[PDB]
């Protein structure tokens, strides 16, 4: 059935908080960060990072990966259930695990590196990719690739997985990556067509460098793996991109899509149809006024070129084959990581939005996936939050029921 686009007779969207995947004694003494989730139909692949109370300045217990199922909860809402969780030992050396889900396998592309800042403090010579493969009632498998051995279409200093998620198509896995180019191959970057200043083009080019990489351009790429085997890096179209950042390659009714977090002057929502996956070519979509909190230079809704490197990741999901109706959980704030809103929107207008629970003290990374469940349209979002003024740091999860009948949205 077709999703409703008109919410005049839909004062409330029905949504339900669903439990996390495990509970433990003294879970409040753990700092759980960086939720990554991809759902396809009835299966999901999920990963998060578990630390002591000091978060990334303390010990990392787990890079915790799981392949699970969507099942009914007590109020007929879809819930995530998993029985088996997996982690490397010495979790601090495993970074940026990026999930793909299929009906029979959960896949995670991780980077092993001794540095805490692998993109900027390590290179191909001292990094190794690991593809973790999870299956129901079977042993985990790990397939590895020293970074030096990866076939690349451009020369890179370093490449890391881009975290938000990937997709399986044409018998291959496609994971987003971020790389630092050896040479200055971005020469005519995408910039604002109607310039705000005489130096916009300069700003647009300079935006590809940052404090971590002052001399090498930071760009989006993808890692394609076949027979998960052969591994290839494909660089994004360098005339049609934005500075490399945490991203997700996702499916919209079997066609590939990109969400790219906005770290640059271009603070507005960055979502594209991927028009040729094996050449990583894009058609960027129009959006309404949906952005992310930033800093003083590139706060929410900045649209003129300048040089900055800031922002949160808050991804989207399409409810239609035509990619004209989307959901997100975005942060309605100029500069602070707080105030998450669920929003339903077309390319032109925010159609309905509302704040989530008032007891959320802060929120940073958010991710959302939608699926058919009991012949109904549902979305699950994972929010990286804190509660009780940073006393309790771990993600929460919501299930949203999206109506198909604009007159009578919710039966019974």
């Amino acid at each position: 059935p077709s999703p409703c686009r008109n919410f005049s007779s839909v004062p409330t969207i029905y949504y339900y908080r669903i439990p996390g995947l495990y509970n433990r004694t003294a879970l409040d003494e753990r700092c759980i960060l960086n939720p990554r989730l991809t759902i396809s139909s009835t299966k999901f692949a999920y990963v998060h990072s578990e630390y002591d109370k000091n978060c990334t300045r303390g010990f990392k217990y787990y890079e915790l990966m799981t392949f699970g199922e969507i099942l009914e909860g007590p109020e007929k809402e879809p819930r995530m259930f998993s029985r088996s969780f997996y982690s490397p030992t010495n979790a601090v050396n495993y970074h940026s695990c990026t999930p793909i889900v299929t009906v029979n396998e959960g896949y995670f592309l991780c980077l092993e590196c001794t540095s805490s800042d692998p993109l900027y403090k390590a290179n191909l010579s001292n990094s190794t990719f690991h593809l973790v493969i999870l299956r129901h009632n079977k042993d985990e498998k790990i397939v590895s690739m020293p970074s030096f051995n990866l076939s690349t279409d451009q020369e890179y200093v370093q490449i890391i997985p881009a975290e938000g998620g990937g997709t399986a198509e044409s018998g291959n896995l496609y994971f987003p990556c971020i790389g630092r180019l050896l040479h200055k191959r971005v020469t005519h970057p995408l910039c604002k067509k109607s310039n705000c200043s005489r130096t916009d083009d300069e700003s647009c080019l300079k935006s590809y460098y940052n404090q971590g990489s002052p001399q090498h351009q930071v760009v989006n790429c993808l890692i394609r793996i076949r027979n998960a085997p052969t591994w290839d890096v494909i660089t994004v179209d360098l005339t049609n991109t934005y500075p490399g950042s945490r991203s997700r390659i996702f499916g919209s009714f079997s066609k590939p899509m990109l969400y790219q977090s906005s770290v640059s002057w271009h603070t507005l929502l960055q979502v594209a149809e991927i028009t040729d996956l094996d050449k990583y070519q894009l058609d960027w979509l129009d959006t309404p006024y949906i952005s992310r909190p930033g800093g003083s230079e590139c706060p929410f809704g900045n649209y003129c070129p300048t040089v900055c490197w800031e922002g949160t990741y808050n991804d989207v999901y399409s409810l239609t084959p035509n990619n004209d109706l989307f959901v997100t959980v975005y942060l309605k704030s100029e500069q602070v990581a707080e105030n998450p809103y669920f929003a339903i929107f077309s390319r032109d207008q925010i159609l309905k939005e509302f704040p989530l629970d008032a007891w959320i003290s802060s929120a940073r990374t958010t991710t959302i996936s939608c699926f058919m469940f009991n012949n109904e349209i549902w979305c699950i979002a994972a929010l990286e939050i804190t509660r009780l003024n940073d006393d309790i740091i771990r993600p929460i999860y919501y299930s949203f029921w999206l109506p198909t009948d604009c007159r009578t949205p919710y039966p019974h």
Partner: protein
């Protein structure tokens, strides 16, 4: 939302004390703006950075840093909002935890030509530094 009185980042701000700069004890969850105000003397040019203790003590910055504020627009107010908590949009480790100390300085000298100066500047000549003793009891 608890909003602490904003810090105006300019040379006439008497809250920057000799030998000590500006010391405060923000609690987790508090909000505080640092503001470079527009023109009504002349506009004062600054890049304002978060730094470690050593750098604040020596009024010295290294290239591997990104301004919290780039005060280089005479025609408009520029505001940076801090919420004292773990999470923010900053991608270079801005993060606040209880019982830890944090530092903000500028080594700019106030003129356009001294904007990118790495040593001294108003941190030294005006004690324009902020010490934030987060989650602490003074």
């Amino acid at each position: 939302s608890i909003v602490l009185e904003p810090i105006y980042w300019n040379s006439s701000n008497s809250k920057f004390l000799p030998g000590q700069g500006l010391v405060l004890y923000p609690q987790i969850g508090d909000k505080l703006d640092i503001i470079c105000p527009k023109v009504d003397g002349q506009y004062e040019y600054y890049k304002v950075y978060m730094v470690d203790k050593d750098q604040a003590d020596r009024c010295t910055i290294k290239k591997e840093n990104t301004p919290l504020l780039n005060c280089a627009k005479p025609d408009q107010d520029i505001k940076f909002t801090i919420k004292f908590q773990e999470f923010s949009p900053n991608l270079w480790g801005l993060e606040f935890q209880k019982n830890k100390d944090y530092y903000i300085i500028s080594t700019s000298n106030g003129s356009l030509e001294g904007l990118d100066n790495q040593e001294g500047g108003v941190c030294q000549t005006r004690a324009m530094k902020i010490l934030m003793k987060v989650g602490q009891d003074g």
